[PDB]
Amino acid sequence: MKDLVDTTEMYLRTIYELEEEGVTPLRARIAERLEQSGPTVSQTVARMERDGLVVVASDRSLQMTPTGRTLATAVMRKARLAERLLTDIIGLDINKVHDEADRWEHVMSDEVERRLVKVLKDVSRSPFGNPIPGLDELG
Amino acid sequence: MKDLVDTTEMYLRTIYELEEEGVTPLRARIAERLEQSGPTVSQTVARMERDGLVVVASDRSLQMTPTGRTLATAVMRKARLAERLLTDIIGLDINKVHDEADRWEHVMSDEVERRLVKVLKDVSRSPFGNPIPGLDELG
Numbered sequence: 034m035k036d037l038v039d040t041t042e043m044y045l046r047t048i049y050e051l052e053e054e055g056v057t058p059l060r061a062r063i064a065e066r067l068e069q070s071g072p073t074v075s076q077t078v079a080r081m082e083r084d085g086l087v088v089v090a091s092d093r094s095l096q097m098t099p100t101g102r103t104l105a106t107a108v109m110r111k112a113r114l115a116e117r118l119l120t121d122i123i124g125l126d127i128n129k130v131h132d133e134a135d136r137w138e139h140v141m142s143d144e145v146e147r148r149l150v151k152v153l154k155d156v157s158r159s160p161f162g163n164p165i166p167g168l169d170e171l172g
Numbered sequence: 173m174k175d176l177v178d179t180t181e182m183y184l185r186t187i188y189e190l191e192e193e194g195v196t197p198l199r200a201r202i203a204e205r206l207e208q209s210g211p212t213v214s215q216t217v218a219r220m221e222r223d224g225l226v227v228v229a230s231d232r233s234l235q236m237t238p239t240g241r242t243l244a245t246a247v248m249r250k251a252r253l254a255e256r257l258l259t260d261i262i263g264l265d266i267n268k269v270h271d272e273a274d275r276w277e278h279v280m281s282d283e284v285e286r287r288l289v290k291v292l293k294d295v296s297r298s299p300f301g302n303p304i305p306g307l308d309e310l311g
């Protein structure tokens with residue numbers, strides 16, 4: 034099992050987050066926050082294209098296809114719902130919540146999410162301040 | 173990400189479970205319950221030996237080394253604590269709990285487990301009747 038658990042999903046999560054912070058999505062920036070080499074990033078992104086999940090634009094910025102964006106959104110949703118579960122119910126020290134959720138986000142089923150929406154007091158945003166996306170699509 | 177999420181841990185979980193049911197651990201039986209080909213199983217087990225996690229005995233039965241057994245035990249502990257969390261708090265339909273936990277068991281940290289022990293009403297056994305092992309070692 035790779036440290037990122039699901040490589041492709043982590044590249045999409047990265048692109049998503051860069052967008053959230055008004056940062057242009059560049060392969061160069063993915064390598065930086067995921068601590069992966071350039072060729073490695075270049076190869077993965079290349080595969081994501083043939084898979085139809087992202088497009089390397091003329092300016093070389095990364096443009097997620099609608100299907101790429103749907104998957105990325107669901108990964109963010111699972112992560113933030115996990116972060117909420119880990120904080121609100123399990124009581125995991127906040128300093129460990131991000132890394133834990135970073136792994137769980139890749140194995141959480143839509144079904145468990147639905148349950149978390151019903152059990153959690155509120156799913157407006159994650160414990161770190163960001164809005165929990167895709168709630169309406171969840172289903 | 174492979175469907176087993178963490179292949180090695182699943183082979184150990186399988187060996188553990190076969191032991192729980194008084195079934196001789198054989199590569200042949202791992203292939204059957206994990207739906208993997210014989211050569212694939214033979215190759216994985218071969219690697220687990222060099223890794224010092226298991227020994228292929230003269231009679232060809234699988235004997236987990238103490239280190240192999242410690243990891244297997246922790247995987248069972250994480251799985252059964254996840255099963256307990258999914259049933260007792262999250263309310264995931266019991267018919268989906270085994271598969272969900274089957275994935276979570278590979279990404280749960282010792283830290284979250286400790287929290288689950290404190291939050292769950294009781295961790296004597298999983299929702300499916302089996303004892304939750306390694307609780308004292310958890311730490």
Ligand code: NI
Nearest residue numbers: 043135136138
């Ligand atoms: Ni992740």
Ligand code: NI
Nearest residue numbers: 182274275277
């Ligand atoms: Ni598993």
